C-alpha cells in the first residue's frame with residue numbers, strides 16, 4: 001500500500017541527453033539515432049531575446065558552430081535544420097543507447113515525467129501534469145532548456161515535452177518534439193500571460209479512488225448526485241466540467257472500490273463546499289489533481305516497463 | 307524557479323535490478339559485480355512467516371534452487387551466504403553495468419530515492435525520508451521486496467535501503483545493504499509497532515528557505531527567538547529539537563536569503579501556533595519535512611551527477 005507522486009524510471013532517457021553549445025549558450029539536447037533535438041534559442045545572444053529572427057541567426061551558423069558533447073565524447077555536427085521552435089542537428093554517430101521511441105503531443109490533464117538536466121547531465125526526475133492552460137509547474141533553472149518530458153509504455157519512450165521557458169508568473173512552457181508550443185506561447189522574451197488555470201476534475205476523482213484503495217475513506221458520504229448537478233458545483237470552484245468520457249475512464253476504479261462515479265462526485269461536492277476541516281487525504285491537506293486515472297491504476301497494480 | 311520533490315536519475319540503479327525466485331516467491335535483487343543481494347525472506351513459504359528459521363531454510367537450498375534473471379538472461383548461481391537479513395548470491399557473470407557504488411547506513415531525517423521494482427523490472431522512482439522512528443512512507447505492493455533506496459553524489463551510487471516489509475499501520479521498513487534493519491523491526495509477521503513519529507524540524511526550516519528563494523515569503527514575520535524558546539514550541543507540536551549542528555547546516559541557506567536561522571525559527575513558531583489560515587507554501591497546505599538542507603541547495607543550484 002501507500003501512494004506517492006512516482007516518476008517513470010529515467011534510464012532510457014538519461015542515455016539520450018547531450019550538451020549543445022552555440023556561442024556562449026549551453027543547454028541540453030536529445031540524441032536519438034543520428035539526430036540531436038534542442039530548443040532553437042541556443043542560437044540567440046543576450047540582446048536577440050525580445051524578438052529574435054531565428055532564420056537570419058541560423059543562416060549565419062555552420063555545422064562546426066555547434067559543439068555537441070555526450071559525456072566527454074564530442075559528436076561532430078554534419079547538418080542542421082529548424083522545425084518550428086526546435087533545431088535538428090544531424091551528427092556523424094548514431095546513439096547506440098537509442099530506445100524504442102515515439103513523439104506524442106499530450107492533451108491538457110495528462111501527466112509525464114521530466115528529467116531535469118544541466119550541461120547534458122541529469123539532475124533529477126519528477127512527475128508533471130500539462131495544466132488546462134498549457135503550462136507545467138516544474139523546477140527549472142538557467143541551463144535546463146532542452147530537458148524533456150516523457151511517458152514509458154512497456155519498452156517504448158513517448159517524448160511529449162521539451163523545456164523552453166519560464167513565464168513571469170513562475171510557471172513553465174515548452175514544445176512537443178516537433179517544436180510546436182503547448183498553448184499560445186512564443187520563444188521570445190515578450191508580454192505573454194498564461195490563461196486562468198482550472199483544476200483537473202477527473203484527476204481529483206482518480207486520487208479520491210486512490211485514497212479509498214489505500215484505506216483513507218473518512219470523506220465518503222452517503223449521498224449521490226447527477227452529473228449536471230455536480231458540474232454546477234465544479235464550475236463554481238473553478239474545476240473542469242466532468243464529461244461522460246471522464247465517467248467512463250473512471251469505470252475501472254469505480255468497479256475495484258464498489259463506489260459509483262456519481263457517488264464519488266457527491267463526496268467531492270461536500271469536500272468543495274465544506275472543506276477538509278483540518279483532515280488530510282493521502283497525507284495532503286489540499287485536493288490533488290496531478291494523478292490521472294491511468295496513473296492511479298498503474299501505481300495500485302504495479303505496472304513495470306519491459 | 308519552482309520547487310518539486312525530485313528523485314535522483316535512476317539509470318545507474320535500473321541496470322542492477324534482477325528477478326530472484328526460490329520456490330514460488332519472486333522478488334527483486336541488486337546485481338553488483340558477481341553478487342546478487344536480496345531479502346532473505348525469498349526462501350520462506352506462506353506458513354513460515356510467523357517465525358521463520360532462516361538458517362534451517364537456507365541449509366535445505368542449493369545454488370540451482372535460486373533462479374536469477376536479468377531481463378531474459380538467466381544468471382547461474384555458484385554460491386550463497388546470509389548476512390543479517392540479506393542473501394548474497396554469487397553468480398558466474400559480473401554485471402557489466404555495475405556503477406561506482408558504496409553501501410551507507412543513513413541517519414533518520416535524511417532523504418533518498420526509491421526505485422520501486424516488480425519481477426526485476428522498474429515501475430517508478432520517488433523521493434523518501436528515513437523518519438525519526440526508522441520507517442519510510444513509500445508505495446510498495448506484493449512483489450516489491452528488494453527494491454532499493456539510494457543517493458547519487460557525482461558518479462557514485464550510495465545504496466542505503468532495501469525494502470522488506472509493510473507494518474500493519476501502512477508504513478514501510480527495511481535494511482541497509484549489510485542486512486541490518488533500520489529501527490527495532492524483524493523480518494517476521496509478528497507484533498511490531500513503529501515508535502511515535504516526529505516532524506524533522508531542520509527539514510521544515512530548509513523548505514521555508516526554499517519557499518523564500520522561490521518568492522513565497524508571506525509567512526516571514528518581523529520577530530526573532532532564542533534557540534531554547536524555539537525548542538519549547540517545537541516540543542509542544544511534536545517536532546524534533548533543533549541543535550546548534552542543525553543551525554550550522556542551515557548556514558548556506560541563511561546566507562543566500564539574508565534571514566538568520568533564529569529569525570526563520572520565529573516565523574516557523576508563528577506557523578505552528580497560528581496555522582496557515584488557508585495559505586499555501588510552495589503549493590502545500592501543510593509544513594513539508596522531507597527536504598534536507600542539502601536537497602534544497604542541490605535543487606536551487608542545479609547539481610548534476612557525472
Ligand SMILES: *[C@@H](C[N+](=O)[O-])[C@H](C[C@H]1CCNC1=O)NC(=O)[C@H](CC(C)C)NC(=O)OCc1ccccc1
Pocket residue numbers: 025026027028041044049140141142143144145146164165166167168172186187188189307
Ligand atoms: C532555458 C535556457 N537555457 O538553458 O539556456 C531557460 C529556461 C529557464 C530560465 C529559468 N527558468 C527556466 O525555466 N529559458 C529561457 O531563459 C528563455 C529564453 C527565451 C529566448 C525563450 N526565457 C525565459 O524563460 O525568460 C524567463 C526567465 C529567465 C531567467 C530566469 C527566470 C525567468
Ligand SMILES: *[C@@H](C[N+](=O)[O-])[C@H](C[C@H]1CCNC1=O)NC(=O)[C@H](CC(C)C)NC(=O)OCc1ccccc1
Pocket residue numbers: 001331332333334347350355446447448449450451452470471472473474478492493494495
Ligand atoms: C515484499 C515481499 N515480496 O516481494 O515477495 C513484501 C512487501 C510488501 C507487501 C505489501 N507492502 C509491502 O511493503 N513483504 C512482505 O510481504 C513481508 C514478508 C515478511 C517475511 C517480512 N511481510 C509483510 O510485509 O507483511 C505485511 C503486508 C503483507 C501484504 C500486504 C500488506 C501488508
